Write a protein that binds this ligand. Structure first.
Ligand SMILES: *[C@@H]1O[C@H](CO)[C@@H](O[C@@H]2O[C@H](CO)[C@@H](O[C@@H]3O[C@H](CO[C@H]4O[C@H](CO)[C@@H](O)[C@H](O)[C@@H]4O)[C@@H](O)[C@H](O[C@H]4O[C@H](CO)[C@@H](O)[C@H](O)[C@@H]4O[C@H]4O[C@H](CO)[C@@H](O)[C@H](O)[C@@H]4O[C@H]4O[C@H](CO)[C@@H](O)[C@H](O)[C@@H]4O)[C@@H]3O)[C@H](O)[C@H]2NC(C)=O)[C@H](O)[C@H]1NC(C)=O
Ligand SMILES: *[C@@H]1O[C@H](CO)[C@@H](O[C@@H]2O[C@H](CO)[C@@H](O[C@@H]3O[C@H](CO[C@H]4O[C@H](CO)[C@@H](O)[C@H](O)[C@@H]4O)[C@@H](O)[C@H](O[C@H]4O[C@H](CO)[C@@H](O)[C@H](O)[C@@H]4O[C@H]4O[C@H](CO)[C@@H](O)[C@H](O)[C@@H]4O[C@H]4O[C@H](CO)[C@@H](O)[C@H](O)[C@@H]4O)[C@@H]3O)[C@H](O)[C@H]2NC(C)=O)[C@H](O)[C@H]1NC(C)=O
Ligand SMILES: *[C@@H]1O[C@H](CO)[C@@H](O[C@@H]2O[C@H](CO)[C@@H](O[C@@H]3O[C@H](CO[C@H]4O[C@H](CO)[C@@H](O)[C@H](O)[C@@H]4O)[C@@H](O)[C@H](O[C@H]4O[C@H](CO)[C@@H](O)[C@H](O)[C@@H]4O[C@H]4O[C@H](CO)[C@@H](O)[C@H](O)[C@@H]4O[C@H]4O[C@H](CO)[C@@H](O)[C@H](O)[C@@H]4O)[C@@H]3O)[C@H](O)[C@H]2NC(C)=O)[C@H](O)[C@H]1NC(C)=O
Ligand SMILES: *[C@@H]1O[C@H](CO)[C@@H](O[C@@H]2O[C@H](CO)[C@@H](O[C@@H]3O[C@H](CO[C@H]4O[C@H](CO)[C@@H](O)[C@H](O)[C@@H]4O)[C@@H](O)[C@H](O[C@H]4O[C@H](CO)[C@@H](O)[C@H](O)[C@@H]4O[C@H]4O[C@H](CO)[C@@H](O)[C@H](O)[C@@H]4O[C@H]4O[C@H](CO)[C@@H](O)[C@H](O)[C@@H]4O)[C@@H]3O)[C@H](O)[C@H]2NC(C)=O)[C@H](O)[C@H]1NC(C)=O
Ligand SMILES: CC(=O)N[C@H]1[C@H]([C@H](O)[C@H](O)CO)OC(C(=O)O)=C[C@@H]1O
Ligand SMILES: CC(=O)N[C@H]1[C@H]([C@H](O)[C@H](O)CO)OC(C(=O)O)=C[C@@H]1O
Ligand SMILES: CC(=O)N[C@H]1[C@H]([C@H](O)[C@H](O)CO)OC(C(=O)O)=C[C@@H]1O
Ligand SMILES: CC(=O)N[C@H]1[C@H]([C@H](O)[C@H](O)CO)OC(C(=O)O)=C[C@@H]1O
Ligand SMILES: *[C@@H]1O[C@H](CO)[C@@H](O)[C@H](O)[C@H]1NC(C)=O
Ligand SMILES: *[C@@H]1O[C@H](CO)[C@@H](O)[C@H](O)[C@H]1NC(C)=O
Ligand SMILES: *[C@@H]1O[C@H](CO)[C@@H](O)[C@H](O)[C@H]1NC(C)=O
Ligand SMILES: *[C@@H]1O[C@H](CO)[C@@H](O)[C@H](O)[C@H]1NC(C)=O
Ligand SMILES: [Ca+2]
Ligand SMILES: [Ca+2]
Ligand SMILES: [Ca+2]
Ligand SMILES: [Ca+2]
Ligand SMILES: [Ca+2]
Lengths: 388, 388, 388, 388
């Protein structure tokens, strides 16, 4: 119809209710489920779907051996119906590649997949299910993008890309696309020192992205974008409640414009909702690995270097495997506010569960409630032993 | 289009004709069929579908071991095409949870799923495939609902919930929703002493629900709701023809305002059509277990404590397993009256058939005919031995 | 839109071209294909589909053992996309039963399924995917119908039913339905002595049905119906070219108003296009069993008791299994005439191939061409040994 | 809507970006994927799909033994969603046969399948999913067609057919169809000596086809068609860069009006984009077998007998199997020019990999970019050993 505009503010988050869960690994033990990783959720005006990077093989398939690897010629961005597992028969390929992002502008969808060898990758921007623009690697070192949905405002959909080192300074660019065409791009600015896999959402004509500083920060870098002026800023979440992984233990005061030290060259895709007192941070419970997952209300986390939790909700027990997590919202729902949502990737197999030769995941997703709901934990649920 | 109004009365039931059957267990012996239980049927203005609570695994899958349990993080309400089995590839998830209800108001559908641990469950009310309202447990003891379709009148769709004990008094509430929002709720009133899993239908601007008194009654409690005044009453079916299970033998006189004694703390979801002489009761043939199923015409059953059968129709032989049963009607069919329909859940596996480690079911469904049709019996049809 | 009217005459049949083939048995050797029998083809204004009576199990499934039986509680009329096999995941159930017919009136479709025990069966007439009318057995001996499509003219869709003996006189009725409601019914009249499984088609406001005289005739009975006057006549195909099976050898002169003797109490569903010189008869090559299949042009076959073939086309070699065959046409195609089409059921398994415990089939279908096309033979193609 | 007209010229090809890949063989190792060969890609105004000739069996199925054969009664043209594999459950049969072509005219699609024994084959032309015209073999020696999409201009869709010898002169005809009806046909003219499997595309009201001279040429014959005058010409690509296979080594000067000698009675379906300096040729890297695949920019290749490459892009390494390749374009995309695309069939199994008894393939497809993108190689990716 018309391009969607971010006219609403976030709803008050008082708790999180269950939104979707596909139990992919449980089901795929005896059904034709594709091996995946790097999942996310994204809405169209009339439907919300699950997204992920397939590995081009079923879990039970012999070609599942080796899927711990991130980039191959057999990966593709696929989408499928909410809470269903990604099967060979219900998955729709959006594009070919090993890194992606996707978002609906209100009229139609833009999907981006990057493929190629490490020193010669390229991004192909699809719009209305047709290829429209291509961008070649500028740093010739694994051109990569968000791994979760982008956000649009009046046709303009900003996307964050990084090309270059994962263990030192890299070259990050913010591209402003409209109908798949590049309107503008700018190099990253601000105090964020390294940017990867940004998790974004929008409200009141502003897009907020919580990313990953793989190089040095255990606190998470944040990029705020103005889709109209097509400009941005960057900093770190100030709060001493650290949210990357692995990470050092929580201090009493964080860092606003520098990476909090203690762990280098590693991290995990993550997210947060930075809205004054209505601020909630997601993070693995373990400071050592992708284990467990919790939501913590940290009022003014982005700007207050001593902010600590005031409420919380456990999503996955520390005795269960978690993984990537990112933001998305149904910008086409009724009501006066945007309901914050998120997904957590539940990784199974390698490297933590090496009795199997594969690596995959299932998805659990929640959205905010203004009620103060009881909590439950949501594990992947599969028994690795069944796969032996 | 416009909200549906219950303007018609029930058609004269002179017999029951076969409506749908999915032979799920038979087929799933060698195909990717999801393990389920607590099924029902529900119509949209242009299509009628099968519904159930998946267990998040296929029957042949190794994760089928243990599906005798009712509440887990791997269950979800799914719907699929009429008479097809619930497969991994054709099932649509309506919401995540282990207790549900769903109904179309004429414009769009409302689905409700409850999830969580026993002392901290919550209901999420979906409307137009989007989450709209959430209700937290009020008694912190397995918040639960109908397990069959709700009914709407001019946008207002009442739903019966129970929170609290299954073996003593509990807290039942009737919620009046419109477009997924709570218009009002009231505590249960009348003479029904315990309410669970209500089976409802509507005609002439009135909704009738036949429920389950798990605590003491072998006769079935009945809740009649006025969707306009948003008020209700409750009593028991007076007739000495008892319809819960397990149950004592049939007496010569029933009880109108108290549970008929003889069996405590147990029961089965069931239903009835209470329409003067056009009254028909469904029930298992066995008074000991979920075995067999029959329809009995008992004129004035609700109000006559000595009413006995005048006609009948066998649905499932006493030598075959039955289970839950509930009401639904296609409120969007042609004609001058609403054709009463019902489904019977045919449970296979545990606990009755313990040679297998799973528990599932298939569905058989019938609707009324004004003709006096010959009868047949409709078993699930699978051979457990094939699964050994 | 509007009800379809049979305003065109048949196109000149100079040969037959391949229309559809699903290779169901070949494919189902390693995929979830439903066991079926009694197939046919039928068109909607915008799509043509395959139809059949499922046995409620896959071919590879253990429940396939025993599918040689015709009537069970696990059968249903299903339809699926043209030339695809009937799989668990792509088959749509039209109704529950072990005998059926179906046809589109131009506005919507009417489907009829008969179910029940031999002495108490009933037909349920569905229209617009909703049950509308029910007809109870009148002779209490396997109420049964066409097993191929019916035909409509201005909303009126006649259907031929038989109730009673298969080895002596029975009670045949012609029902005239409009929107699933019975407008009228009449007992069979004319000289046909026994009627079963009629194969019908329409042109120039007249419906012609070629049926099966199971009792005594090896020539085929014919019922011509006037859908406007709602009246009919019946006789036998006069031609000495006999088309039932099993059957005696071809004589030099046939019988117009009596069954041609030689074989009693047996037969096979078959068809023909009776259009003056443009007359073509279908039949098995073997006079002993459902083996092979051929089309023979027999000018004036219906009215000329000495008519012999003038052209022919082999469809299935006598070294391959055939089975039922019937007529259908796409009444919604472009052009000035109706293109005659037909299907042949290719039965595999029992009783001819008893190394397997099942019985199923695949479908081959052709339509007429005004060209004189080269011919090929179209076997089912599966290797029974693969199933051992 | 309206018939599409070839009003645009080709976009400047500066490189090729990944468009689609189904990894069919990898996935089909453990899922119900149909055995195929002779694939292609073709767009409708609102969707682009993969096409191929199924062998009527799954890869893992026992009936896969023998699929090295090209013509059987079990083959059919099927289409399925872009980048998905051709599965039993997602494949749509367009028609029955062992040779085909298909194209959308802007209003609807025309599909053509040829079937029959070698000396009696026939083509059936389908339009709007209905059979419309039939053409009988004129040379009674394997009537055959393109094996890739045809192209339309204002309703007129030319198709190239060949009937007769594959090792000597044959009878090639160009048919001009409009709405499935034959408007005209002409015998091949010009200097091309043998024509097979033409790969076509259109721009500026002209259709260019790069075909295969199976008889003597290692250079490729070219047919240019005027869809308005309904006339054509034929010649060979002049360039010394030879593109058939097997083939002799590249000389320094090619042949414009005669087959370049060195290899007789063999070849492979291939293609090219002949657009002045914007000319690109596709070809296997190996001169001995269907191994590897590369794109080479050869300015003025069609008319310059000494033209050599100026740029190139590897598509498949010479250490991986390739096969057929052809052209297609999305004539319904936005923009001022038509983006050239192509697919490469990646054959697996027999005859090169004879450890398995089957022959199949997967598909890789690319489209042009005006950017100068980095390249990667795209193998089928399956491990034959897994199939042993
Ligand atoms: C039914 O459902 C309801 C609804 O869910 C249940 O009630 C919920 O209960 C939750 C658990 O009690 C509760 O969540 C906690 O909230 C605390 C905040 O509330 C408290 O403080 C404020 C401020 O003074 C008060 O207003 C309020 O009244 C409370 O007292 C959080 O502080 C909790 O989070 C911390 O603890 C958990 C352990 O449970 C950690 O996993 C988490 O990371 C937090 O602690 C770490 O981080 C802080 C900050 O840096 C450190 O100070 C601390 O030492 C920990 O650090 C270690 O661990 C981390 C992570 O491993 C590591 O990185 C670091 O290095 C250190 O090693 C928690 O979020 C909900 O708010 C509450 N909801 C409601 C509405 O009440 C109810 O119980 C259920 N009913 C039943 C019967 O079960
Ligand atoms: C072809 O098709 C047609 C159509 O279906 C077939 O005809 C149908 O035949 C049915 C079976 O005969 C028949 O169903 C029965 O109807 C009886 C009512 O009709 C009779 O009574 C009235 C009133 O005086 C008359 O008008 C009428 O003419 C009849 O005489 C019911 O009473 C029957 O139900 C009872 O019996 C069955 C056993 O078959 C029980 O399973 C059922 O629960 C009922 O009996 C129990 O309950 C009563 C009430 O409390 C007790 O009094 C009784 O002792 C039983 O109690 C024990 O069992 C229950 C359940 O296990 C347990 O809870 C309790 O504690 C006790 O242990 C039955 O419904 C259809 O009406 C009839 N339809 C038509 C249109 O005719 C025809 O046969 C078929 N043809 C062929 C050739 O097969
Ligand atoms: C490429 O493609 C084209 C197109 O298909 C191929 O050409 C086709 O070739 C067909 C085979 O030759 C041919 O079909 C035959 O046509 C005969 C009719 O044509 C002839 O007669 C008329 C009249 O005088 C002439 O106008 C005409 O020129 C011909 O001479 C039919 O008579 C044939 O059918 C009979 O034979 C077959 C055996 O092939 C039987 O299976 C069939 O049942 C018919 O014979 C039985 O029935 C008759 C009638 O009662 C009996 O008289 C006879 O004895 C047989 O009876 C026994 O068998 C039956 C069945 O088993 C049993 O019930 C009974 O009791 C007895 O035991 C046949 O139909 C096509 O017309 C022709 N098409 C065209 C356009 O030319 C071409 O060959 C192909 N090219 C190549 C290179 O292969
Ligand atoms: C990141 O990505 C970019 C983008 O892809 C990568 O850069 C690309 O690199 C490609 C490989 O170097 C390059 O492709 C080559 O281009 C050559 C043309 O360019 C050159 O010549 C012109 C003219 O003078 C100059 O303008 C230009 O600057 C270059 O110098 C082609 O000639 C190449 O093709 C030939 O070589 C390959 C071997 O690689 C053969 O497979 C191919 O068939 C061609 O050679 C055969 O054919 C010719 C013509 O007849 C014969 O003369 C020759 O002897 C060969 O013949 C034998 O082999 C064939 C086939 O087997 C057989 O039939 C015959 O009988 C003989 O046996 C090649 O296409 C891209 O243009 C370039 N793209 C860009 C934009 O730069 C970059 O490297 C990547 N980065 C990294 C870090 O990897
Ligand atoms: C393009 C790409 O390879 N992304 C990979 C990403 C990357 O290596 C990291 O961000 C350092 O740059 O890491 C991970 C990961 O599970 O940690 C998975 C992604 O597949
Ligand atoms: C929410 C829930 O657990 N419902 C369960 C219900 C419940 O235990 C009973 O109504 C007593 O309260 O019983 C049964 C049952 O087969 O008998 C199945 C349901 O899964
Ligand atoms: C309703 C029914 O059973 N129809 C059966 C029909 C019938 O027995 C015969 O027409 C004699 O009446 O025969 C056959 C058959 O393969 O020959 C199959 C049908 O399933
Ligand atoms: C109609 C037909 O059989 N086409 C076949 C084609 C043909 O034999 C050749 O063009 C010589 O005429 O060859 C090949 C091939 O892989 O080389 C495959 C096709 O199936
Ligand atoms: C998987 O691959 C490894 C490495 O190639 C090999 O050694 C191992 O045996 C394989 N595992 C399986 C189950 O094939
Ligand atoms: C199912 O689980 C039980 C309990 O854990 C175990 O003892 C049993 O062996 C399992 N059954 C199967 C078939 O695995
Ligand atoms: C099929 O059933 C028969 C009859 O019950 C039995 O004797 C036979 O062994 C079964 N065949 C198979 C393969 O189970
Ligand atoms: C395939 O067929 C050949 C030829 O009929 C036979 O000799 C071979 O054993 C078969 N291969 C398999 C795996 O069955
Ligand atoms: Ca980090
Ligand atoms: Ca009870
Ligand atoms: Ca399987
Ligand atoms: Ca007979
Ligand atoms: Ca050649």
């Amino acid at each position: 119809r018309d391009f969607n505009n971010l006219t609403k503010g976030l709803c008050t988050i008082n708790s999180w209710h269950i939104y979707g869960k596909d139990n992919a690994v449980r089901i795929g033990e005896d059904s034709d489920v594709l091996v995946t990783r790097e999942p996310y959720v994204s809405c169209d005006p009339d439907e919300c779907r699950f997204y992920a990077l397939s590995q081009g093989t079923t879990i039970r398939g012999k070609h599942s051996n080796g899927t711990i690897h991130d980039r191959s010629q057999y990966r593709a961005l696929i989408s499928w119906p909410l809470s269903s597992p990604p099967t060979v028969y219900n998955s729709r390929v959006e594009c070919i590649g090993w890194s992606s992002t996707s978002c609906h502008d209100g009229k139609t969808r833009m999907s981006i997949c990057i493929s190629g060898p490490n020193n010669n990758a390229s991004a192909v921007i699809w719009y209305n299910r047709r290829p429209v623009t291509e961008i070649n690697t500028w740093a010739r070192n694994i051109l990569r993008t968000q791994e979760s949905e982008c956000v649009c405002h009046n046709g303009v959909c900003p996307v964050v890309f990084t090309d270059g080192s994962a263990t030192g300074p890299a070259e990050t660019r913010i591209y402003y696309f409209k109908e798949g065409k590049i309107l503008k791009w700018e190099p990253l600015a601000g105090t964020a020192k390294h940017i990867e896999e940004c998790s974004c959402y929008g409200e009141r004509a502003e897009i907020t992205c919580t990313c990953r500083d793989n190089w040095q920060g255990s606190n998470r870098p944040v990029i705020r974008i103005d889709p109209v002026a097509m400009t941005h800023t960057s900093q770190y979440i100030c709060s001493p409640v650290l949210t990357d992984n692995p990470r050092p233990n929580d201090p009493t005061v964080g860092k606003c414009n520098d990476p909090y030290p203690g762990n280098n060259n590693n991290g995990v895709k993550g997210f947060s909702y930075l809205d004054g007192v209505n601020t909630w941070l997601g993070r693995t419970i373990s400071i050592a690995s992708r284990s467990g997952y919790e939501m913590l209300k940290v009022p003014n986390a982005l700007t207050d270097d001593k902010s600590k939790p005031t409420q919380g909700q456990t999503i996955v027990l520390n005795t269960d495997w978690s993984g990537y997590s990112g933001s998305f919202m149904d910008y086409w729902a009724e009501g006066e506010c945007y309901r914050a949502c998120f997904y957590v990737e539940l990784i199974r197999g390698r490297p933590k569960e090496d009795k199997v030769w594969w690596t995959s995941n299932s998805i659990v997703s929640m959205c905010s409630s203004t009620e103060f709901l009881g909590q439950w934990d949501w594990p992947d649920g599969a028994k690795i032993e069944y796969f032996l």
